[PDB]
Design a protein around this ligand. Structure first.
Ligand SMILES: CCCCCCCCCCCCCCCCCC(=O)OC[C@H](COP(=O)([O-])OCC(O)COP(=O)([O-])OC[C@@H](COC(=O)CCCCCCCCCCCCCCCCC)OC(=O)CCCCCCCCCCCCCCCCC)OC(=O)CCCCCCCCCCCCCCCCC
Ligand SMILES: CCCCCCCCCCCCCCCCCC(=O)OC[C@H](COP(=O)([O-])OCC(O)COP(=O)([O-])OC[C@@H](COC(=O)CCCCCCCCCCCCCCCCC)OC(=O)CCCCCCCCCCCCCCCCC)OC(=O)CCCCCCCCCCCCCCCCC
Ligand SMILES: CCCCCCCC/C=C\CCCCCCCC(=O)OC[C@H](COP(=O)(O)OCCN)OC(=O)CCCCCCC/C=C\CCCCCCCC
Ligand SMILES: CCCCCCCC/C=C\CCCCCCCC(=O)OC[C@H](COP(=O)(O)OCCN)OC(=O)CCCCCCC/C=C\CCCCCCCC
Ligand code: HEM
Ligand code: HEM
Ligand code: HEM
Ligand code: HEM
Ligand SMILES: C/C=C(C)/C=C/C=C/[C@H](OC)[C@@H](C)[C@@H](OC)[C@@H](C)CCc1oc2c(O)c(OC)cc(OC)c2c(=O)c1C
Ligand SMILES: C/C=C(C)/C=C/C=C/[C@H](OC)[C@@H](C)[C@@H](OC)[C@@H](C)CCc1oc2c(O)c(OC)cc(OC)c2c(=O)c1C
Ligand SMILES: CCCCCCO[C@@H]1O[C@H](CO)[C@@H](O)[C@H](O)[C@H]1O
Ligand SMILES: CCCCCCO[C@@H]1O[C@H](CO)[C@@H](O)[C@H](O)[C@H]1O
Lengths: 42, 48, 99, 85, 370, 62, 365
């Protein structure tokens, strides 16, 4: 819709801090939109 | 031998005046556009 | 005075005033183009910058401060080993082409 | 206008986005502008207003350009500048 | 419609550093258009019969509205054409542009065609220089063994220059410029395959800028300077580069005692005049122009341009000074000491190109250790 | 709180393309009249008493 | 290559497709004979007619080059009319750019031939120059000024003849450049064919198939041209142009070159100056409207009986107008010409578009 995704796709990490949060913790979810960048969580 | 004598000189006066005007103006237009390049600065930053 | 005239010539030639090294000024024929293609990243990138810097000075009809001129004694042939081999390879092929 | 209305209300969904809108708005506007006010501001925009405001900021104005990567084809600044009119 | 007008002009990549010496290509395009435009308008009032040719030209200058300005613009435009042609060729030799072989050789054809074209145009007013120029130049062909004389009479349409000659020359002069235009377009197409050379002789692919607006405005500035030079001649000294003898109608019984060629042919005329042999002079004349086709094969330097080559530069200016010497000699009587100065200048011309410059090239290579 | 000449020339004449053109058309017709009159006056003054228009009165009556 | 040798072409184009190359040959022929005639022609009114007789009597083979040029102009028009007819019948006009450039080509060739006919300065030369340039006088307010400007005076005279030689000299080369553009647009689509159906599933290389067929066509063109030059060089010409121009007298049975007769009949049918000039201009410019008047769901007339009948009626009508143009302005020719003129515009603007719609209906689409 009106809101663009946090990160627009196209086709990093060098420290512990930037690495924390990268490990997955829940099952995967894939989203596709008409107006918004796709996403995959977990 | 040259009936056009007086007319070419009158025209020549107009040509000189017009050139005195157009040459520096076009030159100013040339420098305006070219200023983008003449003052540009380069820097080389290779990885190392 | 040949070595004496050499340093004189080097400065008279003046590509050093634009910061170029002698090999940056060679006429590019197919042998040279192949040799440049064979250069390692750093030598290729440096060459590109020196040429770009020189073209820029040329456009402004300017030259570098004298302390930045390429020095005769420090100018070295970075291209020679590559070009010499490219030429050797072509000669070898040309020999083979005769029966 | 409809896209903007939807973005505004859908953004203020959850305590964090609302909290941030409070903190930043007091610093930027000196007050929290209520949705009803944003609506009035949006409602009054029409084609004439869009043309006039866009012309004011975009028309024949010098842009700032930034390029990075394989940009041999990024147009020359003069050409970019002429594209502004 | 867009493309090829665009990618062939608007976004054409060009070196960032080409100098004013690169302006002559567009100035030549402008000289060609000028000649074609003033030419067509003159042709609307010119008649090619020997009884009325000279007369029709005075009618143009005296009674056709602005006929005089169109005429002197055509006459002086031919001079501007050559000034630009020689600057253009000089630029090419100095900067090694001749390494673009196809572009260069087409250029040599262009030089010859413009010379032939200007020759025929000069014959049209049928004044004294017109008549004797037609006589002498067509006769160069008589040096061809076995058929030479036959070829001349065939060109003339008779046993001497006469009505048949003037009438066909009007036709040849009329069409050749358009052929030149087509040849020039080919000249440019080959150039576009490589793009332009630049003062350094070093590839400029790492620093190209779009032709528009940088060179479009620079070319316009150059065009203005060309027009100023042309109009200074047309409005203040229309006869300066001309010959008084052509204001005298053609007289087949008498060749003027101080007959001399148009100034842009003087260097070649000096060379031919220096050899006391018919065939020898004709060959030297032909070779003085055709040698341009040999320049590429005579290139010895490891560098393309003369910018970084001191010795080659000195020899280059000696060649220019020598052409200036030959131009001066071509305007002097065949008497002492001019006969000897001209022979030395003629020998020096071929020596600089065939021997001294290739040699300077090798010496410079040695001094740079490659 | 006051602009300069160029800023005014910009706003009213050059900004809009339709008006930048009308400005040139008008300026061209005005310049032509002033330039021709001026240059003609300079030429005739440099040559005062030599041109037909200067001596014509002596023979006219026709 | 790829602009000739391996150019893809429909396997079924017929002889009607040979006229494009024949037009190219007519153009080259006119340019070659033209230049050689220009080597002996002088444009002064005191000597123009004389120089032409000098070409025919004393220049070696001057007579054959001259009659080849004169009859070549006639062959040029025969081919032009065949070429346009092919286009209308087969719907080739849907190639819009190619077609409109073609219309420009037709007008330029007409203007070119007009000016050449003036060069020998015979009676027809002079009155043709008078009448045709005067068409411009129909333009309100400035028409007369335009005519005098073209003439270089208050009547056709020396200034006219001299500039016409220059215009006639250069225009054919301009035509050649325009024709090259004509072909470039064509190459974007390739040729249409008798069926009007895309031939992409059955293309053959231009060489050797059409190169040899074009050569056979060229041979037939040369036969027709030489039958005229060697056996009847004056058949398609006008005896009155063997009489030097006389500004004080217009021949009583003056008539246009045969290839201009249909248009002349149309103009003559309207007893009003501006109206006649507008009808003349429109009789040619209407070609630019054909594409907009196409109502059929099918491109070619091959499968359209009603359209074919109206097409041949148009050809028969142009034949009628050609005949009328050669007759005096007397009864019943005046009325036959008016009907034929009206029928011409009626077939193109109304009857053909209508037949197209009816045919669609009959096919249920
Ligand atoms: C008449 C003869 C017949 C031939 C027909 C005429 C055609 C003329 C040739 C075409 C050249 C025209 C052209 O494009 O001019 C560009 C050129 C523009 O130079 P520029 O914009 O100042 O360039 C700065 C330099 O690269 C950087 O140079 P700089 O910063 O050191 O300053 C140099 C500049 C300013 O220096 C001063 O003079 C002060 O002086 C000028 O160039 C003036 O003008 C000329 O060179 C004058 C042409 C002379 C004739
Ligand atoms: C006045 C205007 C003058 C303008 C200048 C002349 C322009 C000429 C236009 C080009 C026509 C020539 C051409 O290249 O078309 C070949 C055209 C096609 O005939 P084809 O090669 O036998 O093709 C067989 C048919 O497709 C298959 O059809 P088919 O089996 O029924 O046989 C037809 C053929 C054989 O039928 C019989 O007559 C037996 O009759 C002929 O065409 C002979 O032949 C001619 O019209 C010229 C033949 C003269 C020898
Ligand atoms: C043909 C017969 C014609 C008769 C000849 C007429 C004689 C006229 C001679 C006057 C020519 C004007 C010379 C003024 C230019 C002097 C000058 O500036 O030279 C130095 C300068 C240094 O430049 P770079 O090495 O690139 O370094 C740049 C550092 N910022 O050199 C140049 O500008 C070189 C450009 C040369 C091109 C013009 C040559 C003159 C033309 C004459 C005819 C040429 C010969 C070909 C004819 C064959 C037939
Ligand atoms: C312009 C003024 C010129 C004056 C007009 C002169 C009159 C000359 C008329 C004679 C023309 C020759 C006609 C002989 C051809 C007859 C023929 O074969 O017709 C049948 C045949 C059947 O073919 P398909 O439907 O494709 O099916 C194929 C099945 N195997 O039809 C065709 O060949 C159609 C081709 C027509 C093209 C030529 C038309 C004649 C040209 C005249 C001028 C045309 C008008 C445009 C002028 C506008 C200005
Ligand atoms: C009617 C004559 C000519 C026309 C119209 C013409 C036009 C041009 C144009 C428009 C260019 C590009 C701009 C420039 O670099 O100047 C060019 C380049 C060039 N021309 Fe010509 N030219 C003519 C004659 C000649 C002659 C007589 C020669 C040489 C014997 C020649 C040699 C060249 C070469 C080699 C280049 C490349 C220049 C470079 O990039 O360094 N031309 N010419
Ligand atoms: C490369 C282009 C051309 C060159 C170099 C050229 C050169 C010349 C020269 C040197 C003259 C003699 C001028 C004099 O009277 O002193 C001349 C005359 C003439 N040219 Fe051209 N010409 C060119 C193109 C044309 C074209 C395209 C036409 C006509 C379509 C033309 C028509 C004439 C005519 C009519 C004359 C005779 C009148 C006169 O002498 O001024 N020229 N030309
Ligand atoms: C100097 C005159 C002309 C020349 C040299 C010329 C040449 C050509 C050539 C070489 C072809 C391809 C062969 C063919 O299909 O016939 C062609 C096709 C065509 N021309 Fe012309 N043409 C000329 C005038 C015209 C005119 C006057 C028209 C119509 C107003 C026109 C309309 C077309 C069309 C529509 C095509 C495509 C034909 C198809 O594929 O069915 N041409 N022309
Ligand atoms: C589209 C091409 C051309 C057409 C349709 C054409 C047509 C004509 C026509 C109808 C005439 C009158 C012939 C007569 O009855 O005497 C004529 C005369 C002439 N044409 Fe052309 N022409 C063409 C191209 C040229 C060219 C390129 C030249 C010369 C460069 C030329 C030179 C002449 C000359 C000098 C005459 C006068 C002598 C004569 O009447 O035969 N034509 N032309
Ligand atoms: C039908 C067309 C024909 C036959 C064309 C032939 C063209 C030939 C050449 O062009 C390619 C030629 C013009 C060109 O040679 C390279 C010139 C540099 C030759 C220059 C030239 O001029 C002279 C000239 O102008 C004169 O005027 C009154 C008089 C002359 O001596 C008395 C001469 C003369 O002694 C020479 C060598
Ligand atoms: C400087 C160049 C100029 C002014 C060019 C003008 C070109 C105009 C048109 O071409 C595009 C024009 C030739 C074309 O109209 C479409 C023709 C079909 C017009 C045909 C035409 O011919 C006549 C003709 O030949 C005559 O000969 C003795 C006599 C004529 O009546 C007495 C006529 C005449 O009454 C008409 C209508
Ligand atoms: C740009 C200045 C160049 C020198 C102009 C001299 O020009 C020369 O003048 C002679 C008469 O004195 C003429 O006979 C000769 O044809 C002409 O080229
Ligand atoms: C190709 C078959 C053409 C028909 C032959 C008649 O041809 C006609 O003859 C008349 C006088 O006899 C001429 O005035 C007229 O211009 C000509 O087209």
């Amino acid at each position: 819709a009106a809101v663009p995704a946090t990160s627009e796709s196209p086709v990093s990490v060098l420290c512990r801090e930037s690495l924390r949060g990268q490990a997955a913790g829940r099952p995967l979810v894939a989203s596709v939109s008409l107006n918004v960048p796709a996403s995959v969580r977990y | 031998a040259e009936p056009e004598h007086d007319h070419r000189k009158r025209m020549g006066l107009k040509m000189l005046l017009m050139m005195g005007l157009l040459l520096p103006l076009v030159y100013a237009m040339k420098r305006h556009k070219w200023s983008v390049l003449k003052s540009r600065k380069l820097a080389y930053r290779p990885p190392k | 005075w040949l070595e004496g005239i050499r340093k004189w010539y080097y400065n008279a030639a003046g590509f050093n005033k634009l910061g170029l090294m002698r090999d940056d000024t060679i006429h590019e024929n197919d042998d040279v183009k192949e040799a440049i293609r064979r250069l390692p990243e750093n030598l290729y990138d440096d060459r590109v910058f020196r040429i770009k810097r020189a073209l820029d000075l040329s456009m402004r009809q300017q030259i570098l401060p004298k302390e930045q001129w390429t020095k005769y004694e420090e100018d070295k042939s970075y291209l020679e080993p590559y070009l010499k081999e490219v030429i050797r390879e072509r000669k070898e092929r040309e020999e083979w082409a005769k029966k | 206008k409809n896209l903007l209305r939807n973005a505004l209300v859908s953004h203020l969904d959850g305590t964090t986005p609302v909290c941030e809108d409070i903190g930043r708005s007091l610093l930027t506007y000196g007050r929290r502008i209520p949705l009803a006010e944003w609506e009035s501001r949006i409602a009054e925009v029409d084609a004439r207003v869009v043309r006039e405001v866009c012309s004011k900021y975009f028309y024949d104005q010098c842009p700032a350009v930034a390029g990075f990567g394989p940009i041999e084809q990024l147009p020359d600044y003069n050409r970019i500048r002429s594209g502004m009119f | 419609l867009m493309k090829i007008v665009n990618n062939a002009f608007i976004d054409l990549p060009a070196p960032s550093n080409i100098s004013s010496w690169w302006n002559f290509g567009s100035l030549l395009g402008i000289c060609l258009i000028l000649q074609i435009l003033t030419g067509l308008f003159l042709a609307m009032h010119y008649t090619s019969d020997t009884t009325t040719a000279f007369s029709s030209v005075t009618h143009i200058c005296r009674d056709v509205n602005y006929g005089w300005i169109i005429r002197y613009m055509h006459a002086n435009g031919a001079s501007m054409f050559f000034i630009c042609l020689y600057m253009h060729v000089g630029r090419g030799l100095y900067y090694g542009s001749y390494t673009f072989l196809e572009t260069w050789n087409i250029g040599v054809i262009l030089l010859l065609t413009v010379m032939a074209t200007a020759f025929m145009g000069y014959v049209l007013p049928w004044g004294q220089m017109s008549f004797w120029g037609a006589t002498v130049i067509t006769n160069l062909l008589s040096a061809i063994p076995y058929i030479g004389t036959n070829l001349v009479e065939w060109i003339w349409g008779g046993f001497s220059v006469d009505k048949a000659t003037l009438t066909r020359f009007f036709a040849f002069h009329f069409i050749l410029p358009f052929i030149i235009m087509a040849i020039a377009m080919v000249h440019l197409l080959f150039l576009h395959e490589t793009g332009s050379n630049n003062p350094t002789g070093i590839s400029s692919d790492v620093d190209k800028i779009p032709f528009h607006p940088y060179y479009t405005i620079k070319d316009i500035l150059g065009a203005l300077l060309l027009i100023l030079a042309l109009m200074l001649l047309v409005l203040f000294a229309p006869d300066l580069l001309g010959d008084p003898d052509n204001y005298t109608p053609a007289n087949p019984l008498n060749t003027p005692p101080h007959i001399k060629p148009e100034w842009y042919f003087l260097f070649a005329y000096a060379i031919l005049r220096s050899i006391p042999n018919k065939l020898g002079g004709v060959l030297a004349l032909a070779f003085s122009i055709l040698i341009l086709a040999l320049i590429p094969l005579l290139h010895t330097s490891k560098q393309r341009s003369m910018m970084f080559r001191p010795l080659s530069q000195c020899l280059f200016w000696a060649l220019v000074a020598d052409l200036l010497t030959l131009t001066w000699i071509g305007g002097q009587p065949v008497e002492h000491p001019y006969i000897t100065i001209g022979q030395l200048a003629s020998v020096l011309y071929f020596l600089l190109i065939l021997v001294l410059m290739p040699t300077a090239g090798t010496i410079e290579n040695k001094l740079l250790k490659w | 709180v006051a602009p300069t000449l160029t800023a005014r020339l910009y706003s009213l004449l050059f900004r809009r393309t339709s008006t930048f053109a009308l400005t040139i058309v008008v300026g061209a017709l005005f310049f032509e009249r002033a330039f021709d009159q001026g240059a003609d006056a300079i030429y005739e003054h440099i040559n005062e008493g030599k041109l037909w228009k200067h001596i014509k009165h002596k023979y006219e009556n026709k």
